[PDB]
Amino acid sequence: KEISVIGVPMDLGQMRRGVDMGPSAIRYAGVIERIEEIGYDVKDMGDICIEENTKLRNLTQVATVCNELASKVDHIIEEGRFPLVLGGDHSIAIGTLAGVAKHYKNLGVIWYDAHGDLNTEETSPSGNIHGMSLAASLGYGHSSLVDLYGAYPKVKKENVVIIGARALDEGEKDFIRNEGIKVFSMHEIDRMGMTAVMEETIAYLSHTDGVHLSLDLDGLDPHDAPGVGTPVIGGLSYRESHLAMEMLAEADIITSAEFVEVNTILDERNRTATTAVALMGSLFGEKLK
Amino acid sequence: KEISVIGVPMDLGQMRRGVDMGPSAIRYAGVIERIEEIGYDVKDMGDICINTKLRNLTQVATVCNELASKVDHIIEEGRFPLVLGGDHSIAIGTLAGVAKHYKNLGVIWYDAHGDLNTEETSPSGNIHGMSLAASLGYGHSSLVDLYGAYPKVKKENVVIIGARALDEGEKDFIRNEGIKVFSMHEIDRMGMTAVMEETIAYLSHTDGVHLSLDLDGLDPHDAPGVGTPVIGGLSYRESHLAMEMLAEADIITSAEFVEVNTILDERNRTATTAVALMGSLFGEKLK
Amino acid sequence: KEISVIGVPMDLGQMRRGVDMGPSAIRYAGVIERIEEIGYDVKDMGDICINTKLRNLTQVATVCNELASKVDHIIEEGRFPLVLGGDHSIAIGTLAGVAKHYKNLGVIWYDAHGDLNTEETSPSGNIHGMSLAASLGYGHSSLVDLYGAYPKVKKENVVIIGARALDEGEKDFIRNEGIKVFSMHEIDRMGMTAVMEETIAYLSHTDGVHLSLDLDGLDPHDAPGVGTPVIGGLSYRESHLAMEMLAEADIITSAEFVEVNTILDERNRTATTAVALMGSLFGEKL
Ligand SMILES: [Ca+2]
Ligand SMILES: [Ca+2]
Ligand SMILES: [Ca+2]
Ligand SMILES: [Mn+2]
Ligand SMILES: [Mn+2]
Ligand SMILES: [Mn+2]
Ligand SMILES: [Mn+2]
Ligand SMILES: [Mn+2]
Ligand SMILES: [Mn+2]
Ligand SMILES: [Mn+2]
Ligand SMILES: [Mn+2]
Structure with missing residues (x-):
């Protein structure tokens, strides 16, 4: 029942994409009060202050x-608290997972994203570490x-589930085929329904000793x-993602999480940050009935 | 096939929400002509002229x-009453009038909200x-x-559909009183078709059914x-299908369409969608 | 893997509807480069230069x-004809050209409308x-x-998908001639996967299949x-899935994408979507 929040306003790569504004926008949307209202103790650690190579x-x-x-x-995990990381770009998961990996010996990862972020310096068309x-x-x-x-x-590799993929290089x-990564593309989600996708995901990770959720807001359709x-285009709806968070909450398997890639420059009256806060609310136990 | 339409431009509560414009907006969207086009005789009755707890x-x-x-x-005259809403508190008057003519009356409450507050549980004092x-x-x-x-x-004759903003x-109340409610998560899991089949079966023992359709049951996108x-509500397609299934079951004996607010609307398209939903409810078919 | 593309910027009927802009907007969205990226040889044939009942x-x-x-x-040259539309009346010319080479031709009509009017049943006189x-x-x-x-x-080789505005x-006509039609209510009940599986099975005995995709089959949101x-149309997700299922069935032998109207578009996103649906039709996988 104890959460520590940390913001990482990082917007690096080939060009700025505005995702350094993510932590501020999510805080503007009331993320701290929202989680407190569910009954958690929330410690805001603040934001990390962030002060040639083409590949x-x-x-x-x-x-x-x-x-x-x-x-x-x-x-944060040493202190017995849940780490909730607020993103700029998805390359902060490199640091998040390195920290989480100190505390789990068989860690599951749910990667909720339009992209697989599975490039190396050899396969990347852009050099973007995110x-x-x-x-x-x-x-x-x-x-x-x-x-x-x-x-x-x-x-x-056997502990990863990717959900929402639709823009894979x-x-x-x-890599996915050769390494046997479990991936639910948009076509499979359309065929199975999100309920069936989430039950298979939870079953697939049943053996893990903790599960990290890495939720990139661009897994959702740009309409939402x-x-x-x-x-x-062609992504998951708010309803599908909200249901997915509720099913993860009910299964009680998520032990760390990050919400990344919110970009206020393209947002409409902060509504993507508002949606991110609602998905966190569902993840941390809000129910509709 | 006889319908009488009455508008109630009521917008009361903590503050104006703009829903008094609903009846005018729905008329602007051609509700009368649309119903007549289906083959109904339509009598427009016009509009009713209109503490912190x-x-x-x-x-x-x-x-x-x-x-x-x-x-x-209207019911005494053998006609179907269709009520055009401002705020959802007009359901109190509508159901009181309907209840004079049915002793096991069913109600389908199509809404993002439960509207189940009392004086004691309401955080706002809004009667709607x-x-x-x-x-x-x-x-x-x-x-x-x-x-x-x-x-x-x-209580056993109520079905709420669309709920996602319950206090x-x-x-x-819902848990302690056994109200049948299909929240958005249950609709996602089951699909609208199965939700409406279960609703129609749940109200099988009623002698009439009132549809109280709050347009905020639909997603703000629609x-x-x-x-x-x-946010996170029913699509136009789900709602249009639900109306068609109600039409085919032929169980709806009165209805109200409430909470249209032109101030937040986009070129009246919410009112246009309300008229399309009424068209489906009153027998329009795609084939 | 040889495709020939032709644009037909036709916008006739009662009044202008802006669909003559379709081919330019679809080319602006990069249709040629996109088909080439998948591995196709693309010959650009250019655009064709262009009563009341x-x-x-x-x-x-x-x-x-x-x-x-x-x-x-194009078919005589052994290539795939891809037509880019204004009006849906260009299907008359496309199917006349196709039917010289296919005598048991299948047709998937992806549309909010049936386009089944005659001079006698039309309320408008629009040939589209x-x-x-x-x-x-x-x-x-x-x-x-x-x-x-x-x-x-x-008549037995037609499937209409997405209908919601039939006269x-x-x-x-549909009822009396036995035309296979999936309306939006059937799509919502069955799901798009089951609709496409049934469509593919229904056309099993055709010698080719023409896809006539009117972008107004999709919901105006997309x-x-x-x-x-x-309003009340197919989503982009449903349509992209349908294109992928057709691609894997490998039944589509000609296609047209019509009725894109830049005047009502938002930063060309409808044309961008059309190009994405063509990418899926011609073999892009997720
Ligand atoms: Ca903005
Ligand atoms: Ca407006
Ligand atoms: Ca525009
Ligand atoms: Mn990512
Ligand atoms: Mn340590
Ligand atoms: Mn991404
Ligand atoms: Mn209400
Ligand atoms: Mn009386
Ligand atoms: Mn409501
Ligand atoms: Mn057409
Ligand atoms: Mn059309």
Whole structure:
């Protein structure tokens, strides 16, 4: 019943995408009071203050922020609290998972995203480390990232479930096939329904000793989440995502979480941040009946 | 096939929400002509001219009393009463008038909200957040005993569809009193078709069914112009299908369409959708 | 894997609806480069340069005659004809061209409308509301006998998907001729996966299948820029899935994407969606 929130206003990569405004927008949407109202004790750790290379853009700075984030997430779990990380770009998951991995020996990851973020420096069309954060956490990529806060893979391929994917690069599709990553693409979600997708996901991770939720708001359709770094049409509805959070809450398996890629520049009256807060409310136990 | 239409441009409560414009907006969207096009004889009755714990209590009772008698009289004439809403507190008057003609009356409450508050549980004092509870006999005597000193509807004959913004007190009432409610999560899991089949079967023992359709049951993407929008609601397609299934079951014997708010609407499209839903309810088919 | 693309910027009928802008908007959205990215050889044939009961009948026959002969030549060259639309009346010319090479042709009509009117049942005189009926052999002889004095398509080989704005006489035609139609209510009851599986099975005995995709089949939320928007339509997700299922069935031998109207569009997103649906049709997988 105890949560520590940390904001990471990082917007790095080929060009700014505005996702450094995410933590501020989510706070504007009342995330702290929302979780407190459910009955949690909430500790706001604040935001990390963030002060050439084409294949790995802003690598030194990404590594510096992720090292600080990993140690802060590590210490939140040492204190027995739930770490809730608020994102700019999805490369902060490299630091989040490195910190979480200090405390779990068989960690599940649910990656809720339009993208797989499974690129390496060889397969990336852009050099964006936020398009590499899941691959790096699986142990594939640059040593500065893969060995960050620990010289070992933070997550095992058999413990990942990707939900919402619809903009995978060709090299990511090969990785998924060759490595046997469990992926629910939009076409499978249309065929199965989100209820069946979430039951299969929870069953697939039943053996883990904790589960990290890495929720990129661009998993949702731009109609429901216009304010994201890289919008991709054809995504999950608010209703589907809200139901998914409620099913995860009922299963009581989520032990850490991050909500990333909110971009106020493309948002409409902050409504993507408002939606992110509602999804967190559902994740942390709000019920409709 | 005979329908009488009455508008009630009521917008009371803590503050104006703009829903008094609903009847004018729905008429602008051509509701009369649309119903006549289907093959109905339509009589337009026009519009009714209109403390912090029960806000505007005296005025709400006055309007609902007049509405109750007009709805009663429409049914006495053998006609279907269709009520065009401002706020949902007019359901108190509508159900009081309908209850004069049915002793096991069913109600389908299509709404983002339960409207199950009382004086004690309401965080606002808005009577439009109390109209279902009052119609069940729970609430202020001015409301529960309006146009007849008895409960107008039985708890076992209510189905709420669309719920997603229930207060804690309403959740307790639903659980402790056994109200049948399909929240948005249950609709997602079951699908609208199965929700409506179960609803129609649940009300099988009734002698009539009143449809109380609050446009804020639909998602704000499809119905932006409502008094109190709540994200994550029903689609136009789900609602249009639900109306077609009700039409085919031929169980709806009175209806009201409430809470259209032109101030938040986009080129009247919420009112246009309300008319399309009425067209489906009254027998329009796609094939 | 050879495709020939032709644009037909036709916007005839009672009044302008802006659909003559469709081919330019779809090209602006990168249709040619997109098809090439998948691995196709793309020959760009350019654009064709362009009565009250059969409005603009003479001009429609002229354009449709030219389109039919170009479509003929594409199939004769062993290539896939992809037509980019203004009005849906261009289906008359497309199917006339296709039917020279397919005598048991299937047709998937993806549309909010049936386009099953004749000179007698039309409330408007718009030939774009008559193009399916005319291709079935019903209507004026200028259209019915266009580029061939025979019906281009058999009534038993038609599937309409997405219908929600049928005229009363069109409902009668569907009922009295046994036309297979999936309305929005059936799609909502069955789900799009089951609708497409049933569609594919229904056309099992055709020798080819023409996809005639009117963007107003999609809901105006996902496709605001169309000639005649009708609320309550198919989602982008449903349509993208349907295109993928057709791609894997490998039954589509010609296609047209019509009725994109830039005047009502929002930053060209309807044309962008059309290009995305073509990408799915021609083999893109998620
Ligand atoms: Ca804005
Ligand atoms: Ca407006
Ligand atoms: Ca525009
Ligand atoms: Mn440590
Ligand atoms: Mn991501
Ligand atoms: Mn992403
Ligand atoms: Mn009486
Ligand atoms: Mn209500
Ligand atoms: Mn309501
Ligand atoms: Mn058409
Ligand atoms: Mn059409």
